[PDB]
Write a protein that binds this ligand. Structure first.
Ligand code: AKG
Ligand code: AKG
Ligand code: MN
Ligand code: MN
Length: 343
């Protein structure tokens, strides 16, 4: 039912790249999502990542809970700690942020959220790193095609995503265990571009754009999208399909395009067996600021590092990472890093 596209290995800006970019935009504007074909290596790396996740989630909770850091938000989040629209969600999550050693200048300087991933083991680490490298190559192709489809300079988005704050939620949803099956409530993702992968079980639903339907700007405090539309059609079931990933826009793409793209609402229904999935977020650099592309006189911005840091401090207010940000006033580094820049 969803449209499927094959991305070229390199995007150069030829007229055929532009036509493809236009078709991607159209598919987002019609369906809110599309599929991209994966080759055998991309597929193999996806399956290996799922298998490492399955093996890790079988480890005792005492061990899983130890995969945490007071420097980065990377690591384990137990089920029931995350909340959407006020109702706790069901998946357990391992978040992979940029994996920076304590010798990296940003970690040495104590920038908020910067630090080494607390990996469960080296085998899990290698599976996730090599999967995320392929996801990143796809994200860059997608962002060049999107710029081209809007008749923007080819590097409009990728200039912001150099050394971008790419990160991935590695998710396991439990089987249904009662009448309740809302695994994650309706929400939109806070980032730029989302690439999603899943096993064969099934449970992700997305909402296409709806003519005449008002959508909130979820990056603004007084316009949360959480919970909206949850019990009203249309919700498109994202059918597990071999040999594809799916792609949809996040809040920052809605912001930059002034709503010409909408951040795709999505939710997860628990299945009668456990379900593994990965949600990859291809993001601006921690120091980059998103801006409105088509309203040049608009002064509003989204400073990405501030956006991410505030989000994660609110989501995990008791995590050791948040406590150390507060104890050491790490937010002050964000203020400092903008001091002498051209706004
Ligand atoms: C709430 C609800 O209906 C569910 O979790 O299935
Ligand atoms: O891909 C999925 O299963 C949903 C994950 C999701 O919506 C999220 O992590 O924000
Ligand atoms: Mn999401
Ligand atoms: Mn969150």
């Amino acid at each position: 039912n969803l449209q499927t596209f094959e991305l070229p290995t390199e995007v150069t800006g030829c007229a055929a790249d532009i036509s493809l970019g236009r078709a991607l935009i159209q598919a987002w504007q019609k369906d809110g999502i599309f599929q991209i074909k994966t080759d055998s290596e991309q597929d193999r790396k996806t399956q290996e990542a799922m298998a490492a996740s399955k093996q890790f989630c079988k480890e005792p909770l005492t061990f899983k809970s130890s995969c945490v850091s007071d420097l980065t938000y990377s690591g384990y989040v137990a089920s029931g700690e995350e909340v959407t629209a006020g109702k706790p969600d069901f998946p357990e999550i391992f978040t992979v942020c940029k994996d920076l050693s304590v010798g990296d200048q940003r970690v040495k300087a104590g920038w908020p959220c910067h630090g080494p991933v607390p990996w469960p083991n080296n085998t899990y680490q290698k599976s996730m790193k090599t999967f995320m490298e392929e996801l990143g190559l796809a994200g860059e192709r997608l962002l060049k095609l999107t710029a081209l489809g809007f008749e923007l300079p080819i590097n409009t988005f990728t200039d912001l995503t150099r050394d971008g704050w790419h990160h991935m939620r590695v998710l396991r949803f439990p089987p249904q265990t009662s009448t309740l099956s809302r695994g994650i409530g309706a929400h939109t993702d806070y980032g730029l571009l989302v690439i999603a992968a899943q096993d064969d079980v099934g449970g992700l639903y997305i909402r296409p754009p709806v003519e005449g339907e008002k959508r909130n700007r979820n990056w603004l405090p007084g316009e949360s999208s959480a919970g909206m539309f949850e019990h009203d059609e249309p919700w498109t079931f994202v059918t597990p399909t071999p040999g594809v990933w799916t792609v949809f826009p996040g809040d920052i793409l809605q912001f930059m395009t002034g709503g010409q793209l909408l951040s795709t609402p999505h939710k997860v229904k628990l299945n009668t067996r456990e379900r593994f999935a990965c949600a990859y977020f291809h993001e601006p650099n921690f120091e980059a600021s998103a801006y409105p592309l088509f309203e040049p006189s608009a002064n509003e911005r989204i400073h990405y590092g501030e956006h991410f840091t505030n989000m994660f401090m609110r989501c995990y207010p008791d995590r050791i990472t948040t406590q150390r940000i507060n104890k050491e006033n790490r937010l002050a580094h964000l203020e400092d890093l903008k001091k002498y820049s051209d706004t």
